[PDB]
């Protein structure tokens, strides 16, 4: 199946460097261990799943099982999920539609907003 | 890079845009004429819904990715995000400039090169 190698393995290497470089950030990272996050991303043919560890976090192009969480939202809405007091808004609103266990995405978010100075 | 300090994430998006870029267009040395229509140019990429420019800059070894850029534009590209999967090839980049899907200021011929290049590093299997 495509697994988009390229595109994953260049999204992976962000999201561990802004998430997972610092040790500080290790409670907040705890709070995800062993999750799996579907990313669909609109307009776009691939998902994104997001496999959570303790020494990093995995991407995939493709994945043969089942996602804790799956967030479904046009591109522009990503850079909306690094502030955990917005999340609920974009929910209410519909730009970010959530399937399954709601507390993978906000303990996400969450994470990416204590990651990055305001 | 080796070190524990939290860092900006628009510098990492840009770096990994550029990283992409870089294996996919310039790894094979069988596109080397198709990147040479490229050769000096400046394509700004406005990508709608977002609040940064992405700034891609060809040389003869690499392209170089920017988030900001007070110079000129050779060509200067406005679109959303979920219009890239839709520019396969050119016949393609004709109908996303004709429906205004796809925005072009500039050189037109800068972005037709690009996209002839992609659609290019993809037929190459290197
Ligand atoms: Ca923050
Ligand atoms: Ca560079
Ligand atoms: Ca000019
Ligand atoms: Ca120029
Ligand atoms: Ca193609
Ligand atoms: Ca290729
Ligand atoms: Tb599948
Ligand atoms: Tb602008």
Known sequence: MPFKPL???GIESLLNTFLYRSPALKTARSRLLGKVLRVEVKG???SLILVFSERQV???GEWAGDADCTVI???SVLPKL???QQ???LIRSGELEVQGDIQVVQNFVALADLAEFD
């Open 7 to 9: 595109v994953t393995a």
């Open 44 to 46: 776009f043919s691939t």
């Open 58 to 60: 995995d991407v995939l």
């Open 73 to 75: 939202a046009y591109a």
């Open 82 to 84: 690094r502030d955990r």
């Open 87 to 89: 999340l609920t808004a």
